[PDB]
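agent> fetching stored inputs for the KSZ docking request
agent> found them:
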Amino acid sequence: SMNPPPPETSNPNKPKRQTNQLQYLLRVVLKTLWKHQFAWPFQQPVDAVKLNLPDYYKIIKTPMDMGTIKKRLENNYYWNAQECIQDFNTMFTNCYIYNKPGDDIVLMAEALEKLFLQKINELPTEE
Ligand SMILES: COc1ccc2c(c1)C(c1ccc(Cl)cc1)=N[C@@H](CC(=O)NCCCNC(=O)OC(C)(C)C)c1nnc(C)n1-2
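agent> prediction call returned; pasting tokens
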């Protein structure tokens, strides 16, 4: 078990926007989660080699992480906010799929997801 290529963060063929909702996802949502004490496991793709998780990419076929989301937002990769919200939800779900209830990493994901939900509850109406 090598690592897979990371998710795409650059693709000139993909149409792009910078909507007020996407600006909120960067300035409020990503920034709030990134600074949290429990962000670090999520700030880059899972390194299955260094973590000795040879089954990780056997189980997880839609990897996602906040490093990827941060690059997507900074590079204006998205067309809409729903695409970015889906990336956050994929990241949390992958953690819950791979790990066991009550594991430390699951507790970390749950704490970040609570904050994520609190912030996207106030996603502004698209202008
Ligand atoms: C860069 O470091 C990363 C990156 C990603 C991680 C993890 C670590 C971390 C991470 C884990 C604990 C804490 Cl406190 C924080 C993180 N979790 C991985 C999944 C994983 O490694 N599972 C091994 C399970 C083996 N059990 C284990 O060793 O338990 C002991 C025996 C009590 C020590 C895992 N699953 N999803 C993610 C994200 N991650």
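agent> quick read of the result: Residues 81-98 form the longest helix (18 residues).
agent> awaiting further instructions
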